[PDB]
Design a protein around this ligand. Structure first.
Ligand SMILES: *[C@@H]1O[C@H](CO)[C@@H](O[C@@H]2O[C@H](CO)[C@@H](O[C@@H]3O[C@H](CO[C@H]4O[C@H](CO)[C@@H](O)[C@H](O[C@H]5O[C@H](CO)[C@@H](O)[C@H](O)[C@@H]5O)[C@@H]4O)[C@@H](O)[C@H](O[C@H]4O[C@H](CO)[C@@H](O)[C@H](O)[C@@H]4O)[C@@H]3O)[C@H](O)[C@H]2NC(C)=O)[C@H](O)[C@H]1NC(C)=O
Ligand SMILES: Nc1ncnc2c1ncn2[C@@H]1O[C@H](COP(=O)(O)O)[C@@H](O)[C@H]1O
Ligand SMILES: *[C@@H]1O[C@H](CO)[C@@H](O)[C@H](O)[C@H]1NC(C)=O
Ligand SMILES: *[C@@H]1O[C@H](CO)[C@@H](O)[C@H](O)[C@H]1NC(C)=O
Ligand SMILES: [Ca+2]
Ligand SMILES: [Zn+2]
Ligand SMILES: [Zn+2]
Length: 706
């Protein structure tokens, strides 16, 4: 009986043959295996389905941006964002090197492109042999290290020969036998491109890849290793059906120009022709503004590199062009119709939150649970997972180590909460009482636990001075070094102007007085905590609850609290809200140091002001609608990092449908709670009853579009 014909068998304890001390780990990749494939064509894939039913499976695995082979395949083995490991796209360019990158090119084998530290390099430093087969970055030597057994990429090599090659390596002597293995197949990406996600060719491809995996499992069985191997069946990205009618050509707005170069695709980037002579000299801002809101329902959008949604983490790299394009699903962008390969073929590279861009993940073996289905997770989390499977100390990556513990029978690493590095001090009443120049028209522990029911946010800032200011409706973490609130937490239940009051607990600043704010200047102040809470709550009009805010953002901020927030309280039976300013001028996704904060502190209206680049807001509710946010058994989190812009060009307000463009902006700039943590230096939910690993799972979560 073949392996696919046999039923499920619990591998609680690894049954390894002699000469094996511990189960090896094989990374089997199926390029272009969209997540919807297994959802829909499960009855046609008996081998893949059994690995799913007897292993650890996830409906959707979220890949990196852009959704391309090389960036994702390299992000898997490095656990790094594409902006950090160097491989931004299949085709890219480095200005500082004056060299282009391509799959079919000599620059591909240049070690100056590959940053970070892949798993095979990590394994080598800790005396662990590795045998790879056609994995991106295996041909090139990183840090002067090459896998003990490698093969320079040759797509002409038959798949059946690739499997046998790995099977031959598994038989090597105990001292010369690799402990980590990789496998790569071009299917069903190849068939996906030429005929589309919904075709007879992909079905034939899926069945082909399915039988090929069955051959591997039969091969493992004949070697007596079917219950002694950890298998991770993964993919790089999904597949979307392209159309000729749904394509964007830049020439229609620019003309047959030759001063700009466009890397075509659903994730388009733009660089000048005179490069690197005018790589920085070229002002992209004008071109971006000249391309925005040209169509009534435009399916593309010009984005300056720091203005992209933070969830993508696609700014802090030299190779990424300062001008990018975000496109709607099923849409690609190019300069001229000649540059593009084809318009009506299957493509990928779209937003990583799109339904069809989702990838595959199946963990099978003694280390993985049997028939366990978990929630979605990013591919950068797999790096740490493999380190635990190979007994390796992971290199510094972007994955939350320990967040995938629920996949393993016996988890190896037990994570802990980050210690508070902040210098927590107290702010008593000391300075009474200045004139604010404002016109106003006519015990403690119980209120604490009510405002921060999951625990106060911890200050990961080193070594920032923070005070805890308690009110009757909210608790705010105030900064003494920046003289403004870092965060404000409050609970909003299902059903419950030019005037201000001086907070005697904080030092007075010239920007706290209303006389500072005129009706002419676009810059004003906004509240972190809505004043219409619970008559009218007056402590929300405290000076310590205001932050510098553009008038254009107030359009979004008011609708967020006056309309959406109240609706969410009815739908989710109340919400706990934590809000605050975000300062990331270096667009790296992490909080700025005191040094760079002072460099970006503008002066306006004769006063020095540090204005936020973004504003974060985290919404927390109960998974059980019968419970209020003060009595959650399990949490329901959703975070947002909203861009603080002087205007609303990104939204195309023109037509004046306020209720439409705002919600679309919120959903677009949704982010992981971890993303908010990383960019603000705060830690949430530390006093929550669930374990750290569970809380990591919660904070690293993102909803899939469509
Ligand atoms: C995802 O995960 C990845 C990996 O963890 C994260 O990527 C890492 O980000 C950090 C923070 O940005 C990076 O650290 C910085 O490294 C830079 C560059 O290093 C080089 O910089 C100069 C080259 O021109 C040079 O000055 C440096 O030379 C020495 O510098 C000091 C001297 O004592 C020494 O410590 C170094 O070892 C070098 O010998 C160096 O060649 C560096 O410029 C940054 O310095 C900042 O911080 C230091 C204090 O540590 C401070 O003194 C400086 O003033 C400055 O503020 C900083 O060290 C790191 O390189 C990244 N790692 C990888 C592998 O990419 C990424 O942040 C994560 N992303 C997200 C979204 O979380
Ligand atoms: N290691 C590699 N080196 C060069 N090309 C590769 C490698 N792996 C896959 N490819 C090619 O990349 C293409 C698929 O990439 P993608 O279109 O982004 O899904 C196919 O043409 C593959 O043959
Ligand atoms: C940049 O690269 C191009 C193409 O190889 C080359 O023609 C040019 O000389 C290079 N410029 C510099 C500054 O070296
Ligand atoms: C690629 O692999 C095929 C099949 O083994 C082989 O015939 C061919 O020689 C290889 N190409 C190169 C460039 O070596
Ligand atoms: Ca920063
Ligand atoms: Zn691919
Ligand atoms: Zn492809």
């Amino acid at each position: 009986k073949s392996w696919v014909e046999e039923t499920c068998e619990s591998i609680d304890t690894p049954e390894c043959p002699a000469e094996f001390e511990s189960p090896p780990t094989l990374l089997f990749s199926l390029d272009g295996f969209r997540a919807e494939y297994l959802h829909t064509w499960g009855g046609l894939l008996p081998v893949i389905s059994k690995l799913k039913n007897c292993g650890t499976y996830t409906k959707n695995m979220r890949p990196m941006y852009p959704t391309k082979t090389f960036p994702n395949h390299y992000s898997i083995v490095t656990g790094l964002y594409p902006e950090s490991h160097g491989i931004i796209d299949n085709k890219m360019y480095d200005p500082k090197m004056n060299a282009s990158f391509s799959l079919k090119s000599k620059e591909k084998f240049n070690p100056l492109w590959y940053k970070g530290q892949p798993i095979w390099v990590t394994a080598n430093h800790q005396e662990v042999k590795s045998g790879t087969y056609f994995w991106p970055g295996s041909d090139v030597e990183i840090d002067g290290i090459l896998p003990d057994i490698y093969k320079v990429y040759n797509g002409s090599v038959p798949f059946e020969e690739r499997i046998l090659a790995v099977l031959e390596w598994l038989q090597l002597p105990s001292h010369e036998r690799p402990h980590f293995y990789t496998l790569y197949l071009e299917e069903p990406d190849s068939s996906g491109h030429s005929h589309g996600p919904v075709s007879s060719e992909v079905i034939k491809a899926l069945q082909k890849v399915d039988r090929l995996v069955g051959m591997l499992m039969d091969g493992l069985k004949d070697l007596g290793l079917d219950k002694c191997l950890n298998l991770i069946l993964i993919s790089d990205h999904g597949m979307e059906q392209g159309s000729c009618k749904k394509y964007v050509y830049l020439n229609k707005y620019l003309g047959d120009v030759n001063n700009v170069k466009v890397v075509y695709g659903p994730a388009a980037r733009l660089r000048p022709t005179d490069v690197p002579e005018t790589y920085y000299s070229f002002n992209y801002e004008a071109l971006a503004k000249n391309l925005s809101c040209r169509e009534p329902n435009q399916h593309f959008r010009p984005y300056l590199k720091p203005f992209l949604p933070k969830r993508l983490h696609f700014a802090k790299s030299d190779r990424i062009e300062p001008l990018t394009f975000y496109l709607d699903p099923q849409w690609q962008l190019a300069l001229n119709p000649s540059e593009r390969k084809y318009c009506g073929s299957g493509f990928h590279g779209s937003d990583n939150l799109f339904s069809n861009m989702q990838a595959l993940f199946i963990g099978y073996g003694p280390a993985f649970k049997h028939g366990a289905e978990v929630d979605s997770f990013e591919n950068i989390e797999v790096y740490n997972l493999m380190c635990d499977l190979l007994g390796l100390i992971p290199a510094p990556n972007n994955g939350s180590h320990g967040s995938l513990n629920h996949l393993l029978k016996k988890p190896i690493y037990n994570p802990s909460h980050p210690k508070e590095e902040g210098f927590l001090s107290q702010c008593p009443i000391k300075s009474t009482s200045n004139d604010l120049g404002c016109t106003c028209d006519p015990e403690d522990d119980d209120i604490y636990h009510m405002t921060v029911p999951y625990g106060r946010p911890r200050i990961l800032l080193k070594q920032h001075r923070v005070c805890l200011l308690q009110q009757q409706q909210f608790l705010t973490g105030y900064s003494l070094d920046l003289l403004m609130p870092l965060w404000a937490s409050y609970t909003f239940l299902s059903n419950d102007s030019n005037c201000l009051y001086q907070d005697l607990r904080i030092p007075l600043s010239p920007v706290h007085k209303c006389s500072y704010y005129k009706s002419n200047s676009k810059l004003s102040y906004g509240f972190l905590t809505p004043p219409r809470l619970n008559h009218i709550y007056s402590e929300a009009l405290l000076t310590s609850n205001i932050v510098p805010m553009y008038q254009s953002f107030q359009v979004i901020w008011h609708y967020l609290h006056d309309t959406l927030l109240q609706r969410y309280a009815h739908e989710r039976n109340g919400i706990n809200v934590v809000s605050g300013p975000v300062f990331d001028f270096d667009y790296d996704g992490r909080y700025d140091s005191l040094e760079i904060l002072k460099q970006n502190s503008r002066v306006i209206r004769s006063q020095e002001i540090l204005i936020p680049t973004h504003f974060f807001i985290v919404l927390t509710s109960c998974k059980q609608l019968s419970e209020t946010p003060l009595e959650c058994s399990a949490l329901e989190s959703s975070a947002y990092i909203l861009p603080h812009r002087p205007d609303n060009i990104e939204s195309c307000t023109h037509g004046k449908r306020e209720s439409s463009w705002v919600e679309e902006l919120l959903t677009l700039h949704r982010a992981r709670v971890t993303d908010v943590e990383l960019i603000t230096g705060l830690s949430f939910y530390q006093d929550r009853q669930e374990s750290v690993s569970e809380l990591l799972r919660l904070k690293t979560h993102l909803p899939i579009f469509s």
